[model samples]
Target: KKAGPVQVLIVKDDHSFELDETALNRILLSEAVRDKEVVAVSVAGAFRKGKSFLMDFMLRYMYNQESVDWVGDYNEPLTGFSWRGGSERETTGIQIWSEIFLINKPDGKKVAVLLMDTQGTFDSQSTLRDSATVFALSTMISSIQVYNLSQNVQEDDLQHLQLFTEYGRLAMEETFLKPFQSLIFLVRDWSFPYEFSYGADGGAKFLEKRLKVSGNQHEELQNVRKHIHSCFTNISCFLLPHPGLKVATNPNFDGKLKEIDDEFIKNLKILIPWLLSPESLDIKEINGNKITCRGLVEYFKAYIKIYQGEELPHPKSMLQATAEANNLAAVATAKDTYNKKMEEICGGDKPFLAPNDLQTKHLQLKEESVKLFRGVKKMGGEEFSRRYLQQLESEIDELYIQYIKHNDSKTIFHAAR
Candidate 1:
């Protein structure tokens, strides 16, 4: 994939948002996404809350590559992802960066990282309902959603979660709801007295209390919390100390670097890596294959329409869509793997084995195909077809016979010799 400025895709009215699928496919290609595991990170918040500003350095530190460097050790001052304040909104729809970073897992494999900078929620240009729709779509799509806040976990934040799960939803099947891995409350610019006695653990406990329902005073509020909890597998909260600024003047890149406080750095050192952790969320997959960068826009186009179309969305029907998408990928994966393996083992110019042993290799191919079916089984129930595995076996049987004929000729030649 070509690397350049962060690619922008619009998910808005009166726009050609459908082109995002083609654009993403052009950047990711089919193999890079499907062959490698895909994980996406998205940020959501009110306008002018510094979501884009925060995302810039977040990307700078995410990669170890120098060519893509933006944050200069708090010294090289570089601006990232655009952020500005005025009547005009800086981001519209979803802004997805074109470049994908590689993060090494503890297990020795790797994951491809796609950073999504979403348009800020609720502002002059968009309604609360519009905000809710974007929020719902973000939760549905992203592996991890960083909910930006400048204060304690408040009513508006919880309400956003409520509205999302209520109208903007994923699959109704409890299992399908796992697409949303974690809802992380990133409380920035801490000025209040330390709320917790201890450290991150204590901070976590306090956040949990905030998420808990205090009383039945508001049934709707409790339901909101219930739905929020139901939608995500893990929920966490963290605070960041204020980044000191250049007071009477704008600072140069170096000065800007110095302005970043150490506590903020320490917390980020912990938080960023945690977000990268696979255990932090579920292994997001479609069909039987891991979700690729290429296929993301397709899913986005599928789910966001209801919100974009003014129709209320449901979890079950959306999940049915999810299952269908995943099943198609699973079948593709099964066919790709089966064919690749068969060519390697059975489609030799001379044959990898004698005619008598061709049946043994054919049996091996069938075993491998069955294994793929078992793995795809975890992705969806009926949407994934058992027939793909059967088809692979049928193909393998024909290939094996061809190899047998070739082997017979080779046997005759050797006998003559």
Candidate 2:
């Protein structure tokens, strides 16, 4: 069966958010993603700014693995996420492509890559709170967030960015790691080619000028710049020339390559490869541990539940959610570590070791497991980590008792033989 986009979030009649758990689980918990690290690339911005259109090109690049001419035939219509040239917003809530692209990085590590397209913000009918909720959720789940802008970067855009990312920043304060990974400001229809040139080189210079904190700037303004910088480990910019008059004016435009301007195609070719390069792909992580596809499901549930409320949740609430997810992941991983080590000496098929030797090995495994738990339990405050640690210890103790019983049975069988 062919894979396509699925809507994982929706706005309810009461104006609250709803998550499609079944849909989300089908993608995140699938066999393909199990035990494999994941990198999610999501595009979000104002309505009718051609985000979906841009996403289709990325899809094409990913599909063409041969690395030859990926753009395909000029007459072929682009098909992926639903997109059109119009004032009306086409996407609602959050849509995730059902297909998971597995790529082996240059470092020989395999990762599952997923693409996301969020509902365009600032639509006429949508409330500001609604926009904030969508933006915050996408920021939480994605490894790379492409902030699509129609023209030049304005002060209002920066202010809105600060507002949305502040929630993530506060939630991640306990871990000392940046709240988010890569944030790319993709400016479409860039008019001033002479001022900033074109493509990534130009975009970098433009972003530097916009984000620079001058001595004469107001205190509040300077803080906004500082806050944005603190939230993301890497901030980048990409400039794309206008797709051409036909793409904007022709209502019949179906995303054919022939319709787009030469300059736009030229820069787009540069942008997609650079964005998906092995060095550029960031494996999703929390509290220093890389997140597998299975681990990401827990985080999706945690963040989605937090945003289900009618009102925008406070930063503290977000922090609590993050802490809970991190601790849960820590516990699971720590337990796995203990079980794998113990399996070597006391697995069902293995011969039993001497009682003293088994006891010594058990003690060593227990200590190592506890150390791992402590290292990863860095969020949700001391009380939160303490409670989780205690739970972990009890679980490990149960396994130890089971191993002892299994050893006794093996001893009896040996004696009888």
Candidate 3:
């Protein structure tokens, strides 16, 4: 699949290596502000292969503490929209399926990094594309094209675009990282079965050989090799994936989160351009050794603290609105069902006599359980069936909690009499 033209915006700081803004400039301590405000890097790949999921995962990785709390207080307020299309919601017609992670280097420098996600191209016939229009726009505007190696180096996927050795294909196809900026080929989601095994390399090699009209792909390969060789340039290439959860020998029917493979989280630390600098933005050095951070996205955490005083940040979008609204409805719906079922059980004509004051509920308890589950399912929507189902199960657990309280009183009354 080939990508199209994407407009990139570069906001260079006025103070390159020297100066002060009376405020921002003073923080620089006159040590030169390396223009690191907005370096837009584009993540391009085929759709639904988990781009948005990857983004969400990465953000949480950068912010584990907050994400844990957020997931815990989840209730019915956090809904399906956050899990679903809010994944691709665009800001100002441009889909910003991107993430920002911060790095507080051993030094005092702070980095404000942005990960830009470009629309994935389809692997269709008749278009032997370079995806250079998109590439050129990003480059011309000073943005970098981040090629996630997972979708590209696939078995039958490399044939669509001609890999170029030179900037222009005559000499080489995939345009070489242009003059000023560079190309970052991110090798993500490297599974045990593919990248290292007898699958990708072997297949991609055979296909790369067959697809070469000239030696374009060969050139592209060489360029990738060249970046790997460069020291001044930080060609961030790495792999991340959930650890295959195969913990217990004889697994419990009800699985535990502890069963998850620990190997999956190696505390992924990739080098971003800004992190390699002597100075940075949005970072505060109170004294010397200790530093405070503001917006280094924790890929494992969900909330954002805008500044020192501001509270947590929440996501904004239509799908999110729907999820939230539905979650609230589901919560209310569950309570309504529970209350109604309690009314019928306690005040009905045929009361199971044990606890004199307490009334017996009947089929409605089962209905309440079913209704709560259904409401959560609907609220969670089709964002991610697996996660939504988990939500429904959680609601069911709550329903049982209330049931236990009612049952306990009846037992106490019988024991007293």
Candidate 4:
């Protein structure tokens, strides 16, 4: 089957949020991503503002090798996330790409790359709370959030950004580092080229002017910019020219490069590669540890649950979600360590060892598992870790009994033979 976007979250008719766990599991738990460290890049913005269109270009760059022109043939219709020229909003909730791309870093490590497309915000169909929830969830999950905007950055855009990122800041109270990794403010259909020029340079200058704090400004307004800077380790901006009138008006438009303005294509060529460059790729991390695909699944569930509640979750709730997810991941890794080691001695093909030898090895392996669990960075206090550790010990003891029983059966069979 071919891979494409899968809707992993939805806003129901009743104005409640629902997470499609089965669909999310299919993407995050697949063999390709399940065990590998991952980098998730998600694009989010207001409705019908070309967020998905941007993602298709990013997909093209990732699909093609470095030597080849990733822009591809002018006639080749861009295909990836569902996009079209229309007033009607396309993407609903959060749609994650079904396939995971494996990219090698400059440090010689492979990380799975996942792309996400979020429902356009401020559509007539959605309420303010709904839009904020969607935006908040996407910001929490992604390593790089492409904050897509139309025309130019407005004060309202900055205000919305600060509102959404506050949840991330609240979640990071336990850690010293910033809550989020990178935030790219991608201003599309840029009109003032004469004033700021074009591409990254122009985008940077424009963003600096907008984010700058002046004594003349109101204290509340100044704080909005300061909070945004504090939440993300890196903040950047990119200016993309309009993709031309045909893309917006022509009913038959199919993302053909020739149909797009040459200038649009020119900046796109630079932007996509720069975004996907080895140095730009950030492996998703939690509490300073690199997170695997399976580990990320726990986080997705945790954050989604917080948003799905009846009322907007408090900052304390968000912090609790992060701690719970980290604890769950720690438990999983510790158990895995124990099981893989035990499998070597008790696997189907291995002969049974003497009872004393088996008992000694089990004790050693159990301690190693405990050591790993304790060493892992976790939140929710020592009591939380202690509770989870006890749970792990009980689970491990049950598996040890099964191993002993299996070995005893093998001994009896051999004696009878």
Better of 2 and 3 by TM-score: 2
Which structure among the candidates has the greatest TM-score? 2
Off by over 4 Å in 3: 1-36, 61-94, 97-111, 123-131, 135-145, 151-232, 241-417
- The residue-by-residue lDDT of candidate 2 on 1-417, one tens digit each, is 788989988876466788898998888888878679999898998889988888888899888856678977899999989998767888888888989889989999989998989888888777766777778778888899999998899988887888777654443326777778889999999999989978889999999999999999999889889989988888999988998999999989988899889889888889988888767788987776788888877887777665664344553334676888888899899999999999999999889687889999999998999898887746666677888889889999999999999987888433553
Which pairs of residues collide in candidate 2? none
How does each model score on TM-score? 0.64, 0.73, 0.34, 0.73
Root-mean-square deviation per candidate: 20.3, 18.1, 24.5, 19.0
Report lDDT (CA) for all predictions. Answer: 0.62, 0.84, 0.35, 0.85
lDDT of 4: 0.85
Rank order (by TM-score, best first)? 2, 4, 1, 3
The worst-scoring run of ten residues by lDDT in candidate 4 lies at: 310-319
Clashing pairs in 1: 172-315, 172-316, 287-326, 287-330, 288-330
* Model 4 Cα lDDT, one tens digit per residue, 1-417: 688888888889877888889988888898877999999899998899988988998888888857568888999998989998768888889988888899899999889999989999889898776788788888888899999999988888887788778754554327887788889999999998998877889899989998999999999889989989888878899988888889888999999997989998889989987788877889988777889989888888887776766444543334576787787888899899999999999877789788889999999999999999888877766677777889889999999999998887767334553
How many collisions per candidate? 5, 0, 28, 0
Name the lDDT value of residue 97 in candidate 4: 87
lDDT of 1 by residue, 1-417 (tens): 454444444555543233355666665565666556677788887776767777776666666433433345655554556765445678776666667777666676687777778777767776555666666666667777888887567886777566565654533223543446767888776555366522246457767787787676488667767777776777877676665554112434232566666666666566665665445533445433457655665676677555545345432333456675665666567556766765675454544466556667667766776677557653457434455456655665665566566555645434553
Better of 1 and 2 by TM-score: 2
Q: Considering lDDT, which of the candidate structures 2 and 3 is the better prediction for this target?
A: 2
* Candidate 2 error regions (>4 Å): 169-173, 310-417
lDDT of 3 by residue, 34-68 (tens): 33333334455543343433344433334452333
